[PDB]
């Protein structure tokens, strides 16, 4: 089978200091639960996506409850059927991206110190009025699941090879510079849907989340209630104000961080600039495997 060929083409163990329940770091209890859940899925008829990394993501998502995790998996499979996710990399074509990239900037640029692909989202700059001139929110969400499928199929394997260990997760940087109460309400619908797709259909894919240029009240609230979030979440999520450069550089090598966020990585304006760039390990022949090089989101 070619799923066998694929998972053998990149490192499959997480580093030993990763949170427990991750691949390669399983205690006796968890080990039993994993094949127990697998058996049920096999019995239920599933053939696809029954690998350790996948099943453990759902397991870690339901505190290792084998039954709730089966529900989660089944629902996701149903969604993949209805939504058409298994074929989205062929069917969907976001050809309007060049026109609307400035309106809502979203790009993947290199990796962080743990080998995770970095996702940049400049939400603060969002201008939906201009965007809705050319696209719909239905189309914005397809592009989200398209990018997501790109990460799973092409970005994460390449990142795994480039780092020497399994990379299951992305590192998200969300820039609020420019956000207002007006525009906040205007993107709530999209963010809420994206959040639902993320948690329910792509569990445990979020590894680091940085919000930068947060407004004072938002920044403050997090600071005050920090002592009451569980320590696993408090190590994944960072809400930062206007001085985030040193915080980003602890997580992303300066050579991989865009100059505009305080690093050295540059992108030629000849290729459409950073808003249209997709640079990383997934574009390097040394780290591309039997999956082949990933697609590009648009024609040009």
- Residue 107 vs 202, nearer CB to ligand C8K: 202
Q: Which is nearer to ligand C8K, 48 or 266 (CB)?
A: 48
Q: Give 245-252 contacts, CB < 8 A, sequence gap 24+.
A: 247/210, 248/173, 248/210, 248/212, 250/113, 251/112, 251/113, 251/171, 251/208, 251/210, 252/110, 252/111, 252/112, 252/113, 252/118, 252/171
Contact between 152 and ligand C8K per CB under 6 A? yes
Does position 154 interact with ligand C8K (CB under 6 A)? The reply is no
Residue 107 interacts with ligand C8K (CB under 6 A): yes or no: no
Residue that is written with structure tokens 């399983």 in the block: 26
Indicate whether 58 belongs to the interface with ligand C8K (CB under 6 A): no
In angstroms, what CA-CA distances link 288 with 10, 153, 228?
10, 11, 42
Is the Cβ of residue 120 or residue 275 nearer to ligand C8K in the bound state?
A: 120
- How far is residue 13's CA from residue 266's CA, in Å, rounded to a whole number? 32
Residue 111 touches ligand C8K, criterion: CB under 6 A? no
Site for ligand C8K in 197-226 (CB under 6 A): 198, 202, 205-206, 209
Q: Does 92 bind ligand C8K (CB under 6 A)?
A: no
The Cα–Cα gap between 228 and 17 comes to 24
Residue 143, interface with ligand C8K (CB under 6 A)?
A: no
Cβ-proximal residue to ligand C8K, closest one? 198
| 191 touches ligand C8K (CB under 6 A) | yes
Backbone angles phi, psi at 170, to 5 degrees: -110, 165
Residues binding ligand C8K (CB under 6 A): 148, 151-152, 170, 172, 174, 191, 194-195, 198, 202, 205-206, 209
């Amino acid at each position: 089978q070619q799923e066998k060929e694929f998972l053998e083409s990149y490192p499959q163990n997480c580093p030993p200091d990763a949170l427990p329940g991750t691949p390669g770091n399983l205690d006796s209890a968890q080990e039993k639960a994993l094949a127990e859940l697998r058996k049920l899925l096999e019995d239920a008829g599933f053939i696809e996506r029954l690998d350790d990394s996948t099943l453990l993501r759902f397991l870690r998502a339901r505190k290792f409850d084998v039954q709730l995790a089966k529900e989660m998996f089944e629902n996701c499979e149903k969604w993949r059927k209805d939504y058409g996710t298994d074929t989205i990399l062929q069917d969907f074509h976001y050809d309007e991206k060049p026109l609307i990239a400035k309106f809502y900037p979203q790009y993947y640029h290199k990796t962080d110190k743990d080998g995770r692909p970095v996702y940049f989202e400049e939400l603060g700059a969002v201008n939906l009025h201009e965007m809705n001139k050319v696209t719909s929110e239905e189309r914005m969400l397809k592009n989200l699941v398209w990018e997501y499928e790109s990460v799973v199929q092409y970005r994460l394997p390449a990142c795994s090879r480039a780092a020497g260990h399994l990379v299951e997760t992305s590192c998200t940087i969300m820039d609020l510079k420019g956000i207002s109460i007006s525009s906040a309400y205007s993107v709530m619908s999209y963010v809420r849907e994206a959040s639902y797709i993320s948690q329910n259909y792509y569990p445990e894919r979020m590894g680091k989340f940085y919000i930068i240029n947060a407004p004072f009240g938002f920044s403050t609230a997090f600071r005050l209630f920090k002592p009451f979030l569980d320590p696993v979440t408090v190590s994944k999520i960072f809400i930062l104000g206007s001085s985030y450069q040193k915080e980003l550089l602890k997580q992303i090598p300066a050579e991989n961080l865009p100059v505009k966020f305080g690093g050295k990585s540059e992108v030629d304006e000849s290729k459409g600039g950073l808003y249209l760039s997709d640079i990383g390990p997934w574009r390097d022949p040394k780290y591309i495997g039997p999956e082949g090089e990933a697609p590009e989101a648009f024609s040009m």
